[PDB]
Design an enzyme around this catalytic site. Structure first.
Site, mmCIF file in Angstrom:
data_model
loop_
_atom_site.group_PDB
_atom_site.id
_atom_site.type_symbol
_atom_site.label_atom_id
_atom_site.label_comp_id
_atom_site.label_asym_id
_atom_site.label_seq_id
_atom_site.Cartn_x
_atom_site.Cartn_y
_atom_site.Cartn_z
ATOM 1 N N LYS A 119 30.497 45.455 47.319
ATOM 2 C CA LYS A 119 29.544 44.545 48.028
ATOM 3 C C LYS A 119 30.295 43.435 48.784
ATOM 4 C CE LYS A 119 24.944 45.338 46.400
ATOM 5 N NZ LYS A 119 23.598 44.758 46.611
ATOM 6 N N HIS A 176 34.644 28.686 38.083
ATOM 7 C CA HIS A 176 35.126 27.302 38.309
ATOM 8 C C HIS A 176 34.192 26.374 37.542
ATOM 9 C CE1 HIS A 176 36.667 23.757 40.052
ATOM 10 N NE2 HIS A 176 36.100 23.822 41.279
ATOM 11 N N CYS A 213 36.520 18.138 40.387
ATOM 12 C CA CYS A 213 37.096 19.471 40.143
ATOM 13 C C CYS A 213 38.473 19.300 39.486
ATOM 14 C CB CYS A 213 37.149 20.254 41.465
ATOM 15 S SG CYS A 213 35.823 19.897 42.653
ATOM 16 N N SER A 261 34.609 30.494 44.692
ATOM 17 C CA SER A 261 34.527 30.588 43.217
ATOM 18 C C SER A 261 33.050 30.566 42.847
ATOM 19 C CB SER A 261 35.279 29.476 42.526
ATOM 20 O OG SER A 261 34.634 28.231 42.773
ATOM 21 N N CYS A 294 42.196 21.113 44.161
ATOM 22 C CA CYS A 294 41.465 20.343 45.193
ATOM 23 C C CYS A 294 40.242 19.729 44.524
ATOM 24 C CB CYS A 294 41.107 21.239 46.374
ATOM 25 S SG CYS A 294 39.868 22.514 46.032
ATOM 26 N N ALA A 314 31.492 35.687 47.511
ATOM 27 C CA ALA A 314 32.562 36.467 46.842
ATOM 28 C C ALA A 314 33.962 35.945 47.193
ATOM 29 C CB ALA A 314 32.433 37.902 47.238
ATOM 30 N N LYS A 331 32.112 42.300 35.861
ATOM 31 C CA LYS A 331 30.753 42.436 36.449
ATOM 32 C C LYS A 331 30.827 42.442 37.973
ATOM 33 C CE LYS A 331 27.219 40.229 33.659
ATOM 34 N NZ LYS A 331 27.376 39.950 32.209
#
Lengths: 392, 392, 392, 392
Positions: free
Chosen positions: A227, A348, A88, A247, A378, A244, A222
């Site tokens: 929700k 991400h 990452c 990422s 991270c 949610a 979007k």
């Protein structure tokens, strides 16, 4: 004083999984960012003498993804290319190696960044070569096995360690969801007020028989705020971490040009920022959500900075808990952290995010006329990197 | 004068494809090499500040192959890791980045190398994600698609570009086969006289219920000298390049520890050699076989050396023509080149070879009490790297 | 009285899984058996009016496995072919349909049998067509999914239903192992005394450059009698059923030629036996191990026979418990059942076994100069078939 | 006189590839047809003593597709089931075996038909079991390898042999396209005037969260007459055969109940028709388009009929050329052939079409109060079958 400076910085829009860049390979996203970064630096096609691009999921892309991206960008055949996997953090570790290569005198002009097509990650057959022999086996998602799952606790998604972090820190489902809504709100606002326009290079994608201009991030518009508080926990029975407040899977690239301040001045090039330091931190793979805290404290020691002297922070929002851990342990205002939103809104693209957050940080420092930024990310395997930038 | 010094250097034996290491993953080969390199440097588990390992074929290994190899070796979780893909040059580029990371002041003790299990590269399904819809599709060998074939002349094997070079240089079938026979002879003799013993770390491999000690290179003993003049061309109808004057698919790893001379002296650690410089060279992907000529010429400019002052050369024998082009264009005696044999006899574990040849070079310089070595490796995508080492 | 007669009957040797016939497809095994059956009936290429061959695992064989085997045997293109799947009973159902096709007046000369290469069953990707989308998927062993597992208790192997039967009947571990040892002993002795020689057609198998004559059953000679009492249960924690009191995966084929007695007399062809009747029985899929009891009882009603008038029985040894249930519920002496051994020793090439046991039954009746035989086979899905043959 | 009679006949709608029945497996389509056929025959769930269902592409369906269909229909566990592969003729060969089984006295009430889910045909890995070793391989479409391609001329689609037939017969692109438009027109008309209503059993399919009634054929309403003459040849450079003058991939099932006339009378069941004969013809696989002509001439000899005495013909429209060859060689009016349309409009669910065309023929004979029908179907491997039916 002759520090390394960033003279240019740009990213592609960030596409959703099987979305805008569904049929765009990583090297084409990289090529778009690389081309733009070199044009914005006002360099000829043959002036980059070191190119390092982050990319985690290289399966099926062919030989040397970074070479494909650099030559696809139109840069000269003479440009040395490497493809870098620090999970990452790949996109920031590219910046850090490029920075050190320049300081050591191995290069005069370096291109760093990263790129990921999570959409084009293929499936794998581990035993196609030598034989399954008998009984069912697995057709493995490359993105899951080589990108999202721990290698030691085999099959364990990184979201489970984010849940351990929620439990250890007492981060409630509601507090995570609020961090995620702030990230989503900020991104929609940033997009609406054109605060991403200066940092994005559009792509043209072929849309069946026609062609579309993709010039804006796909995911913030979007998202369904309604929700968020309804979703089931994603990683543990009766947990707090969800789709949610995590990422999303994303396609994107980012590229930055670095050189000595004296070389930018010799070219009549106004730098965006000096790099004042970088830091690498590692601990157990299951503690990755807190690793940015380690990287940022080492960064304060290496730079001689203090947390209070920093105007803006980018901490990559692999999960809301990562941002929320940094706010707790470094005593940071949400007002100074991820001010245009973060990966909980934008996505991400794992090999690009480490560079992407530095592009966003530079744009935001310019827009508010601030001096000092910190970016931290991270890293799967339990690591983090952090970089200090300063506008002059 | 406080040059970066190599304090330790080690490799696994090099196994044949689906041979000795068929059941050993890349990170286990890397772990064996890293563990011995750290041991030979007299370091403890937490004394490596930076680890970079070359690896081209990362698909199906899980997150962060270099992190798996480093922790598998017993190094502490505090050890920052990166996985590097510069194709056939990965292992050398790892040394080059580690070198500049030290000079930049980003580390005091760095570990570099490379590792490759071509045996365990999986198969890919490029359209398993969104569907084949109807009609046959491909199951893609990750080793071929991502390691061995050109990305631009899609599907073309690198041996076709080797045949181009044989044509351009007039290297006959006979002259290439003679180079390969000298490589096999030298390797067979190096093996028999113990000239690889100081550079190899043995692995224990588990053959079901049995255990076996693999302490020697698999390929030279299995070489049929009688069949070499009888093989068909491998890449082109009526060509000169064959399986025996090309390197073979191979499994292996190599690792080295670097630090400032002053740090080696503080630890009472006798260096193997100073790094005196490194160079990168790139040109058209289809000219890769001659890229080492550019890399070595650029290395003499940066170091201030001349070719005549170099005692030994290692030029990776991806094909005999790579060695023969280097001998012609750099005016090198065969007696100073690949003196214990090279990849034509030993194999070419692609992510490891750029580090493996440095390990072999250092041991050879020691055995003949010589001062100055150059290692150079050609690279898929049209590149080459070279490094200069000097014994003190 | 013009009964249907069997005029020829032959089988391939039965190979072990990935053993003697690992490289021989089902249609090549079928072709060998069909060719010898036609030869033994003294027929020419265009004299078979109807061909039906059993085969369960047809995936990857190409169009019309039975058509490939028939034309591969040298039979004329005028020969109508069908491929039949009644699971473990396919080979017997082929005989039953051929039989009724003759009686109906739809043919004068019919060929029946079965063939199975469990070695060459491929792997399936159930979601390759429309996509796996994200996350791991299954690569399904066609032999397991389509051959060995229940369709209703999804994924449950048929051996679990064999364990149910061992529990219901009180068949101990010891009693099952004794049945299996008598099966292996009888097969080993039948082999050594030449009692399989009249029923087997040898195949020539090509081992690279070498050729080998396979003229004998692979499995009985490789049986470890000493390991039988030491195996773990195979299907249930603390159970009785193991790999050695279950049949093994096997490759093989069998074929027989049928015609009216009056047609055999017209051709001067001495029949092996009259078919006196056939019966089909079905019940719950999980009771398959006792289905042969129903089939044989229904066969005595249709033929007017009684159990005591039968000289020899073949009950396919899918598991020892199948034979032992038949012995208890039909009051059969072990001395009249599977007298040359059965699938526990020989193997169970699933599409062939229902025909294979008829071939073995006919040869055994001849060797002991006995009149009346019954063959019965249990079938995945809860079924069984049985057939009555009488020597004249 | 006690002929075999059909007392009931029904089919599912015919779905398009990845269309209406995308998520409906073959055994569920079979179950719908089987249930309806038994309810229309006014039989209890336990009154079928022989069930034979055609199906070509059985990969991934689990054990005994025909057993799954029969038990899924609600028929008793005691019902004997077989799955039959005679390629494109499977559904008619089921009728023919059921017919002979009844005449021979092996059964009193038989269910025959076929079923195919071309949508749910999976992909295959031929070398997953024992290993690909190195280099690319194939992920094989089951539908293509085991359904649509010749086994001798490997990879050759059946459309190439239809082109050979166009060339041998001088069937122009325009004449093929006109036959196809007549088939499409007839089907749309038949559908519009409810001439399929009496022969179709609807299914309910789950439509995401909702549920849809599928009660009508998917393909005739979706066809674009305007594009027919525009399409490129499908099988050969500058050929005549196209996607629109070939049958389409289709999902469907059909089922018929047969018994002796005396048994229908003993049950007070009005028969739809007597079967007056059947015929099987085979020649070279590359001559399959003309094989129906052979089957129909043998059928005239076996029945004592002449072509002039037949009211309606169904010749399965695998390609327009198949219909057009039959019209030429049997001297038949397009007015008497495929009067409600054929596979060029409705689709060719390969294992069901042989039964499907008999259901359509029975309905059409009733609707026009005609006496004598012939159905014929060409078969991969070079075969055809034909069946004569007569209303009383």
């Amino acid at each position: 004083e002759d520090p390394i400076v960033i003279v240019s910085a740009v990213r592609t829009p960030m596409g959703g999984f099987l979305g805008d860049f569904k049929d765009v390979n990583a090297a084409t996203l990289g090529a778009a960012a690389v081309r733009a970064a070199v044009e914005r630096a006002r360099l000829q096609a043959d002036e980059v003498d070191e190119a390092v691009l982050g990319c985690v999921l290289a399966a099926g892309q062919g030989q040397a993804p970074a070479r494909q991206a650099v030559l696809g960008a139109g840069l000269a055949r003479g440009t040395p290319c490497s493809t870098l996997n620090k999970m990452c953090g790949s996109g920031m570790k590219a910046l850090m190696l490029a920075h050190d290569t320049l300081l050591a005198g191995s290069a005069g002009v370096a291109l760093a960044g990263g790129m990921e097509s999570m959409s084009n990650a293929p499936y794998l057959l581990e035993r196609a070569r030598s034989g399954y022999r008998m009984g069912h086996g697995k057709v493995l998602d490359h993105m899951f096995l080589d990108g999202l799952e721990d290698a030691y606790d085999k099959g364990r998604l990184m979201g489970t360690f984010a849940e351990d972090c929620a439990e250890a820190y007492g981060f409630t489902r509601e507090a995570q969801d609020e961090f995620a809504v702030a990230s989503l709100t900020r991104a929609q606002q940033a997009m609406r007020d054109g605060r991403f326009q200066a940092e994005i290079v559009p792509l043209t994608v072929t849309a069946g028989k026609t062609e579309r201009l993709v010039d804006s991030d796909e995911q913030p518009p979007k998202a369904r705020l309604d929700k968020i508080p309804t979703l089931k926990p994603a990683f543990r029975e009766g947990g707090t971490v969800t789709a949610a407040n995590s990422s999303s899977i994303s396609d994107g690239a980012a590229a930055l040009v670095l050189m000595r301040l004296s070389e930018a001045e010799r070219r009549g090039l106004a730098p965006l920022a000096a790099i004042r330091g970088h830091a690498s931190f590692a601990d157990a793979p299951n503690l990755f959500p807190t690793a940015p805290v380690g990287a940022v404290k080492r960064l304060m020691q290496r730079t001689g900075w203090s947390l209070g002297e920093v105007d803006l922070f980018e901490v990559n929002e692999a999960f809301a808990v990562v941002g929320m851990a940094a706010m707790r342990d470094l005593d940071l205002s949400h007002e100074r952290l991820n001010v245009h939103g973060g990966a909980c809104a934008l996505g991400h693209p794992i090999g690009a995010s480490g560079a992407r957050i530095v592009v966003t940080l530079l744009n935001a420092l310019q827009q508010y006329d601030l001096e000092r930024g910190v970016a931290a990310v991270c890293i799967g395997g339990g690591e983090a990197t952090a970089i200090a930038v300063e506008r002059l």
